[PDB]
Amino acid sequence: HVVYVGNKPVMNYVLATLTQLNEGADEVVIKARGRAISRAVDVAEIVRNRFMPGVKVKEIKIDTEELESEQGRRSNVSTIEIVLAK
Amino acid sequence: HVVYVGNKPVMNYVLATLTQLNEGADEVVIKARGRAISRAVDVAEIVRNRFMPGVKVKEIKIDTEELESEQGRRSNVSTIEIVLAK
Amino acid sequence: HVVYVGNKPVMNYVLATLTQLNEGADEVVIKARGRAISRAVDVAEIVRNRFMPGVKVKEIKIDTEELESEQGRRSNVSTIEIVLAK
Amino acid sequence: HVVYVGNKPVMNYVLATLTQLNEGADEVVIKARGRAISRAVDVAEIVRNRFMPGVKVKEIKIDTEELESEQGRRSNVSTIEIVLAK
């Protein structure tokens, strides 16, 4: 059960996360790369702080990926993975 | 030990991380908050995936921190702590 | 749009309210009857005083509804309708 | 001219409301918090349905208040305010 964090308002992504767990889903994975990683973290704190305390931060994985820009630029962009579980 | 990641050139922070580990540092702690969170990650990847290959991410912590907004209102930001170990 | 508030966990209802407004809902209508009336209110407060600060109570309606008791006798319950607007 | 709705039978509170208006009193305010809010509404429907139709539901205000439990528990409890006027 993944949840990709992008540019949309934080709320969208957090609800999606809540509706995932609320949908049973025992463990959910929050992902994002580039400047979105901050939002990813934001999303995980809002969920664990304002909706489901007791929800646990199982894991946080950071890495690198190659991304091709619309202009043909190829570069390394960081990525994060936060695992939330009841 | 720690390395607070602000808005200076990303390289200063990796520099400081490397330098720290150089002296035979048990483990450097990269910390940051808000939109800076993405650079904390960039700094850890740049450091273990390029300058000091093999460095390990001993641990990663996310948390929320309360602040004094401005007009005296309630405010806060997410934080991240990346623990690098040789 | 509406959200009928029954006996499920209060959070499901706020969840549904939030979710509803999320999609750019003109205005969500929280409805309930009998002892449930108190939760309809809890859901509106929890939603505008915690999860989506600034939401406004466009209107509130109370009314009586006739029912088919059980043994075939005359019966009814009060109802409440809370209109939330972004 | 207030009327606090609590645990006593509905009738007590409705009569009090009637005896208020009957006592001249142009506008009366019915209040209650927690699980009593349903009774408050009940009271307003019984008055407007079985004693004084034409009486009008001027306003309905919902809010939150802090309450200290006998056991020292501090929490937010919803409240309602129904304004009845001839």
Side-chain angles (χ1 to χ4, degrees):
Chain A
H1 304 297
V2 186
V3 168
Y4 280 94
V5 171
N7 296 307
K8 300 186 178 187
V10 306
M11 185 68 70
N12 295 195
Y13 302 117
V14 0
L15 289 159
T17 302
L18 289 175
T19 295
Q20 207 87 302
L21 302 176
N22 176 70
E23 225 74 306
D26 281 74
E27 232 168 57
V28 179
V29 182
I30 303 191
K31 313 182 166 203
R33 54 266 283 284
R35 298 180 69 67
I37 282 176
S38 319
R39 206 184 222 49
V41 177
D42 290 358
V43 174
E45 289 300 291
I46 283 176
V47 171
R48 284 189 45 257
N49 296 159
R50 294 147 50 174
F51 298 82
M52 287 178 83
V55 148
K56 302 170 179 297
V57 158
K58 183 182 176 182
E59 303 180 317
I60 296 175
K61 288 169 171 57
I62 61 171
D63 223 324
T64 293
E65 273 186 52
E66 280 201 22
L67 190 189
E68 200 190 77
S69 306
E70 227 59 308
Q71 285 319 308
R73 179 173 296 179
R74 222 152 45 282
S75 50
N76 300 315
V77 56
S78 300
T79 67
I80 201 183
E81 277 193 353
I82 314 182
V83 191
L84 293 178
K86 300 185 186 179
Chain B
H1 294 300
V2 322
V3 173
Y4 297 106
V5 182
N7 306 311
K8 296 176 66 70
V10 190
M11 203 54 80
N12 304 318
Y13 302 128
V14 347
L15 202 301
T17 317
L18 292 171
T19 295
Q20 227 83 53
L21 292 169
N22 182 212
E23 272 82 74
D26 309 64
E27 69 182 25
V28 195
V29 181
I30 300 170
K31 306 182 161 183
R33 64 178 66 178
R35 278 298 180 293
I37 300 184
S38 74
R39 300 163 98 63
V41 177
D42 295 329
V43 167
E45 291 296 275
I46 296 176
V47 171
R48 78 191 176 88
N49 284 172
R50 230 167 80 71
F51 300 150
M52 186 161 316
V55 153
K56 273 208 161 64
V57 179
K58 153 88 68 57
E59 186 198 19
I60 294 177
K61 296 165 292 175
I62 62 177
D63 204 343
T64 298
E65 221 187 71
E66 254 52 58
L67 313 172
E68 300 296 358
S69 57
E70 166 51 65
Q71 310 299 165
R73 285 273 224 169
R74 174 146 50 83
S75 182
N76 57 29
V77 60
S78 306
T79 60
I80 191 165
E81 283 171 16
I82 309 178
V83 181
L84 300 194
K86 189 156 194 57
Chain C
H1 294 300
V2 322
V3 173
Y4 297 106
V5 182
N7 306 311
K8 296 176 66 70
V10 190
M11 203 54 80
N12 304 318
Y13 302 128
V14 347
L15 202 301
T17 317
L18 292 171
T19 295
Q20 227 83 53
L21 292 169
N22 182 212
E23 272 82 74
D26 309 64
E27 69 182 25
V28 195
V29 181
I30 300 170
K31 306 182 161 183
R33 64 178 66 178
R35 278 298 180 293
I37 300 184
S38 74
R39 300 163 98 63
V41 177
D42 295 329
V43 167
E45 291 296 275
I46 296 176
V47 171
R48 78 191 176 88
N49 284 172
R50 230 167 80 71
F51 300 150
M52 186 161 316
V55 153
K56 273 208 161 64
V57 179
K58 153 88 68 57
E59 186 198 19
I60 294 177
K61 296 165 292 175
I62 62 177
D63 204 343
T64 298
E65 221 187 71
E66 254 52 58
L67 313 172
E68 300 296 358
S69 57
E70 166 51 65
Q71 310 299 165
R73 285 273 224 169
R74 174 146 50 83
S75 182
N76 57 29
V77 60
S78 306
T79 60
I80 191 165
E81 283 171 16
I82 309 178
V83 181
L84 300 194
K86 189 156 194 57
Chain D
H1 304 297
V2 186
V3 168
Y4 280 94
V5 171
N7 296 307
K8 300 186 178 187
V10 306
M11 185 68 70
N12 295 195
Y13 302 117
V14 0
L15 289 159
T17 302
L18 289 175
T19 295
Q20 207 87 302
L21 302 176
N22 176 70
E23 225 74 306
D26 281 74
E27 232 168 57
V28 179
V29 182
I30 303 191
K31 313 182 166 203
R33 54 266 283 284
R35 298 180 69 67
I37 282 176
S38 319
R39 206 184 222 49
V41 177
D42 290 358
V43 174
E45 289 300 291
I46 283 176
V47 171
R48 284 189 45 257
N49 296 159
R50 294 147 50 174
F51 298 82
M52 287 178 83
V55 148
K56 302 170 179 297
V57 158
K58 183 182 176 182
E59 303 180 317
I60 296 175
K61 288 169 171 57
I62 61 171
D63 223 324
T64 293
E65 273 186 52
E66 280 201 22
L67 190 189
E68 200 190 77
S69 306
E70 227 59 308
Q71 285 319 308
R73 179 173 296 179
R74 222 152 45 282
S75 50
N76 300 315
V77 56
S78 300
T79 67
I80 201 183
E81 277 193 353
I82 314 182
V83 191
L84 293 178
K86 300 185 186 179

